[PDB]
RNA sequence: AAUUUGUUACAAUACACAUUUUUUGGCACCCAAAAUAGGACGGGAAGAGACUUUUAAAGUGAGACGUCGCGACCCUCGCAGGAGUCGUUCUUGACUUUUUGGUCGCUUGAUGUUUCUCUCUUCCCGUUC
């Protein structure tokens, strides 16, 4: 599909994540799989309750991903063609 | 379910007949059997309305205390009186008793 | 070594308590059938959480274990 | 047998959808995709309201239902009415179908 | 149907939250395509870190459903 | 079309700003751009217009009007915008 | 409003702005570009609308005004398990 | 000519005004340059379709009145209109801007027509109107305006909405 | 035997046999000998319904299916009772299904 | 690398005792000797009781559905 | 002296799939508050009680993340998502460079989470009988 074809294109860029347990991670996409689960690099992280952290190296499940931002540039991407 | 020829025997009164004097359960039967081609889907909508009921395993008709069975056939009457008053266009106040036995047994 | 559908296919017709995730609930009875998904059939089961039920099913996803 | 397939004989009759929020939609029924996707057209969708001295109703399904727009200001109670909902599959709980249509030519 | 991508991963110690309350750090051993993983020495950290911090056991293994996010603490 | 004003209150907000800009600008034509893409600030601001004549007749009557304590300074711009 | 086709499914309809409701109660709101089996969506500009818990007291039955805090995310991928219910809020540029 | 649904209809919907929100309606062929007359009638025809932004300016309008219930609706655009008095009860709770420059409205019957309330808005110009002129007007729009967040482009001074709510009380 | 070996008609006697003989041939003996059922639902309300289909998902349309749910606030109860003339129903929210004698 | 299910493997082989904690809804977590296992990761556990959360009872050999694991631990 | 028919390829829709990564559910629960025959209800302002702080005098339940904002004894020049290059012909593709706000107070911005414990009087403006 194309929704998991645009987070493979995504790779290398700043992305933000909403986890379902309320998290918040932005930071740089190294990888992604067809599963979603992705992992990030040099990451900030900001907890449910708004307490910031920063980790150097994440890997999430992508069951776990609610929602995923990624760079606005890619909206006219050869994808939606 | 039966792919030979071959005699079986059932009860059609069932419940209500063994609540209810015998000229009268036939009275509730053919009020019934009038009923159900009138009901084309209803019948299962009516007479599993109430879903307390249950129907015995010898039994056929769903065995309960027989007030809304006086309910149900009624409203199936109901349903009779119209479709029987829609196609010559009666009222349903001009509908009479003797119009309503008519009805029933013409 | 045994494995979990051979347990279930060892278990047949024998009485056994099935304890749902939820309320700490166990269903105590006699084993009917199982699918593949472990649905679950029994006959003269009784619910604890006290009563007597005749005959049972069971669906896979609901249930926490199986015990003899 | 998949069942759903009985769900797209139903098109174009008036249902309720009743769902895991306990939100019920009242509406014409389209086309329902085989994951029971079920798409409709003029819905007023709603929450029941559980007496019981006043207990507070489902907090995520008010959210959820003044969210639409189409929940109007002046509504006493708790109600939306809208045009084409789409609901995901895995939301239905219940299915209220009307009591017209005959089973017995449908389920086959 | 693809194995997850935690090659880099293994060997390393890592903190992975088990559930919404839950995080274990162990050392990652192995895993597999649910991401079910294993790892040795494992540890429930807790608010008082050396106080309420109590090892599980030598070797645990996590269901990979239960898995929420996974950091290495590492290299 | 574009008009680059000049000259304007830098201590006022950006949004605030754009607003403003917007507010000003809707008497004499349809503004298509709210704010200019650099956002540099103290007066530098791209008011894109949707007709020409909007612009011109923008440039004529708001040159030297009072906005957050400063004149603004109104003229035309030397590039064509983006959008437009 | 608007009256969207009385027969139009999510492949008919693309560009229109959306209005997106997920498990939580929270509301994506924007335009539909693509989706998928399991109808997972992209939205190109999306704002994010929430309800205020005091808010949400409000709503309860007694002209209503909430105060809906919101925050602009664009270009997002959502995800088809969070997604409950899906209707259109306007029509193409 | 006079505002019907059919010209609202008509108009002009598909470029959105990116600023805030989205649909910047311009009523009938072009609500700049309409002409409309009379107050502005058959509201409901947009149906609160959607900071919604409306522009009406270089139109006839006389009173700001006579809307349908609009939710979205956060900007009003009402420059070159002759506004007399705006007195309404619709467009309340909604609307965070109001553009009212080169228009009629008197000092005392744009005072006179809000009412006063306890909050409203948050913009507000008044530029080239009578009122503006009028002695103490500054002071009297802070009062009428009761909450405020701008005045004629200048933001009423904390000190000056200290000392406006000191003459209300 | 994994399914994924079979060809498309061994499928079909499988599900025919597990409809016939295994755990759901409570619900297909009790579609067949008109036996009303009573159902719980994860929600935790409990419908007295007689099943006019059924499927593997265990999804079923049951009609003349009677509802009853309790509330209670602190220890308040109330006993609450809703009919419906047709149902549908989705499989995943059912937990316990009995057949009535 | 060590596989989990290996590892699983070596709890079965290797008769060692193991603690399993379950989701955090349910509150109790399971001890006993995991005897086999299926692809599903639902274990048959020998000897096997359920601590709330040491007075637990003792449950017998019981088959436990892998949709509640969450922990096995030694 | 463009239409129709046949064949080939690509794209879209429906014929699939209940076992940890999306659609056959880890599901549900905090609890409690209006009845009459001038009266209620909401919002704003003032006073007082009880709370806090200092050694009688000062404002209104308390303690914690962020969120964008009101001031500034600071910085800062001032007109160019786009820009350059090459191919190609009057504006297109392929390959490279990478966002104002950078900060501090708030002599209570303004405002949402999350734990614990227990309001009356007066005026002004709207709705309802």
Redesign the pocket.
């Given at each position: 599909?194309i929704?998991?074809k645009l987070l493979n294109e995504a790779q290398g860029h700043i992305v933000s994540l909403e986890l379902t347990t309320g998290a918040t991670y932005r930071g740089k996409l190294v990888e992604s799989?067809?599963?979603?689960?992705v992992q990030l690099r040099d990451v900030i992280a900001?907890?449910?309750?708004?307490?910031?952290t920063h980790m150097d190296q994440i890997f999430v499940?992508?069951?776990?991903?609610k929602f995923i931002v990624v760079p606005?540039?890619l909206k006219?991407a050869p994808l939606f063609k | 379910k039966a792919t030979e020829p071959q005699m079986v025997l059932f009860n059609i009164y069932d419940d209500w007949l063994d609540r209810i004097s015998s000229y009268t359960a036939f009275s509730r039967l053919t009020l019934l059997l009038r009923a159900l081609k009138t009901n084309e889907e209803s019948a299962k909508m009516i007479l599993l309305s109430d879903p307390t009921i249950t129907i015995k395993s010898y039994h056929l008709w769903p065995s309960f205390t027989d007030e809304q069975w006086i309910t149900i056939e009624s409203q199936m009457r109901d349903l009779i009186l119209t479709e029987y008053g829609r196609k010559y266009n009666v009222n349903i106040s001009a509908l009479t008793q003797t119009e309503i036995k008519d009805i029933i047994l013409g | 070594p045994v494995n979990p559908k051979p347990f279930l296919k060892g278990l047949v017709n024998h009485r056994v308590g099935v304890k749902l995730?939820?309320?700490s609930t166990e269903y105590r009875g006699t084993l009917v059938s199982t699918?593949?998904?472990?649905?679950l059939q029994l006959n003269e089961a009784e619910e604890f959480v006290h009563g007597t039920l005749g005959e049972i099913f069971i669906?896979?996803?609901?249930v926490?274990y199986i015990r003899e | 047998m998949?069942?759903?397939?009985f769900l797209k004989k139903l098109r174009n009759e008036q249902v309720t959808i009743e769902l895991?929020?306990g939100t019920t939609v009242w509406g014409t029924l389209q086309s329902v995709?085989?994951?029971?996707?079920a798409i409709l057209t003029d819905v007023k969708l709603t929450l029941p309201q559980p007496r019981?001295?006043?207990?507070?109703s489902?907090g995520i399904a008010m959210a959820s239902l003044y969210l639409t727009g189409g929940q109007q200001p002046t509504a006493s109670d708790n109600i939306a009415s809208l045009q084409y909902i789409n609901i995901?599959?895995?939301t239905i709980?219940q299915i209220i179908l009307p009591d017209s249509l005959n089973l017995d030519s449908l389920l086959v | 149907?693809s194995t997850?991508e935690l090659k880099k991963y293994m060997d390393k110690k890592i903190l992975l939250n088990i559930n919404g309350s839950r995080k274990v750090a162990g050392i990652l051993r192995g895993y597999?395509?649910?991401?079910?993983v294993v790892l040795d020495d494992a540890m429930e950290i807790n608010g008082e870190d050396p106080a309420n911090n109590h090892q599980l056991g030598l070797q645990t293994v996590i269901?990979?459903?239960?898995?929420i996010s996974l950091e290495a603490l590492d290299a | 079309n574009?008009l680059?004003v000049?000259?304007?209150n830098?201590?006022?907000?950006?949004?605030?700003l754009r607003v403003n800009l917007f507010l000003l600008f809707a008497t004499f034509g349809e503004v298509l751009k709210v704010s200019?893409?650099?956002?540099?600030?103290?007066?530098?601001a791209?008011i894109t217009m949707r007709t020409i004549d909007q612009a011109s007749l923008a440039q004529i009557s708001l040159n030297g009007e009072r906005f957050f304590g400063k004149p603004l300074?109104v003229?035309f711009?030397?590039?064509?915008?983006?959008?437009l | 409003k608007i009256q969207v086709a009385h027969s139009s499914?999510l492949?008919n309809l693309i560009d229109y702005k959306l209005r997106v409701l997920t498990?939580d109660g929270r509301v994506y709101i924007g335009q539909l570009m693509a989706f998928?089996?399991?109808?997972?969506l992209v939205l190109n500009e999306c704002i994010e609308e929430?309800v205020?818990?005091?808010?949400?007291d409000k709503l309860?039955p007694?002209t209503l005004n909430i105060?809906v805090?919101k925050?602009v995310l664009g270009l997002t991928i959502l995800?088809?398990?969070?997604?409950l219910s899906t209707v259109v809020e306007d029509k193409p540029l | 000519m006079k505002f019907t649904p059919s010209i609202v209809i008509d108009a002009p919907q598909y470029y959105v005004d990116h600023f805030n929100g989205k649909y910047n309606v311009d009523k009938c062929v072009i609500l700049r340059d309409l002409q409309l007359e009379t107050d502005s009638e058959s509201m409901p025809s947009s149906l609160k379709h959607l900071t919604h932004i409306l522009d009406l300016t270089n139109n006839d309008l006389i009173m700001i009145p006579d809307l349908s219930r609009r939710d979205d609706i956060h900007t009003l655009l009402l420059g070159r209109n002759n506004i007399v008095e705006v007195d309404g009860?619709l467009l309340p709770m909604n609307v965070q801007n109001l553009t009212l420059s080169n228009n009629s409205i008197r000092r005392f019957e744009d005072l006179q027509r809000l009412?006063?309330?306890?909050?409203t808005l948050k913009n507000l110009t008044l530029i080239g109107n009578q009122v503006c002129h009028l002695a103490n007007y500054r002071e009297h729009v802070l009062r009428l305006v009761?909450h405020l967040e701008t005045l004629d482009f200048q933001?009423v001074t904390?000190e000056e909405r200290k000392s406006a709510?000191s003459f209300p009380? | 035997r994994p399914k994924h070996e079979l060809s498309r008609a061994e499928?079909e006697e499988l599900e025919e046999f597990?409809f016939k003989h295994g755990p759901?041939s409570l619900i297909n003996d009790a579609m067949v000998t008109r036996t009303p059922v009573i159902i719980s639902?994860?929600?935790?309300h409990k419908i007295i319904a007689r099943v006019k289909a059924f499927?593997?998902?265990?999804?079923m349309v049951l009609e003349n299916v009677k509802e009853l749910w309790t509330?209670?606030?602190?220890?308040?109860v109330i006993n609450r009772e809703r009919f419906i003339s047709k149902l549908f129903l989705?499989?995943?929210?059912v937990?316990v299904v009995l057949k009535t004698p | 690398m060590v596989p989990?299910?290996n590892c699983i493997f070596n709890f079965l082989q290797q008769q060692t005792p193991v603690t399993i904690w379950?989701?955090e809804?349910?509150g109790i977590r399971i001890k006993g000797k995991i005897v086999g296992f299926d692809?599903?990761?639902?274990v048959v556990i020998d000897e096997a009781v359920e601590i709330p959360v040491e007075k637990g009872t003792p449950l017998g050999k019981i088959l436990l559905?892998?949709?509640?694991?969450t922990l096995i631990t030694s």
């Open positions: 599909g929704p998991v799989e067809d599963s979603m689960n900001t907890e449910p309750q708004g307490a910031v499940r992508g069951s776990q991903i606005d540039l006219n | - | 995730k939820f309320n699918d593949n998904y472990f649905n669906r896979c996803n609901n926490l | 998949k069942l759903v397939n895991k929020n995709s085989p994951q029971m996707n019981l001295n006043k207990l507070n489902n995901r599959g895995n709980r | 149907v997850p597999d395509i649910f991401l079910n269901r990979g459903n239960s898995i | 574009t680059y000049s000259q304007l830098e201590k006022i907000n950006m949004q605030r200019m893409n650099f956002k540099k600030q103290r007066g530098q791209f300074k003229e711009s030397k590039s064509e915008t983006k959008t | 499914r492949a498990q998928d089996k399991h109808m997972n929430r205020p818990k005091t808010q949400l309860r007694r105060k805090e925050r995800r088809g398990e969070q997604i | 009860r009412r006063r309330a306890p909050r009761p933001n904390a709510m009380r | 499928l597990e759901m639902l994860r929600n935790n499927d593997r998902h265990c999804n509330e209670k606030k602190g220890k308040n989705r499989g995943d929210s937990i | 989990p299910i379950l989701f809804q349910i692809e599903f990761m639902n559905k892998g949709d509640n694991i």
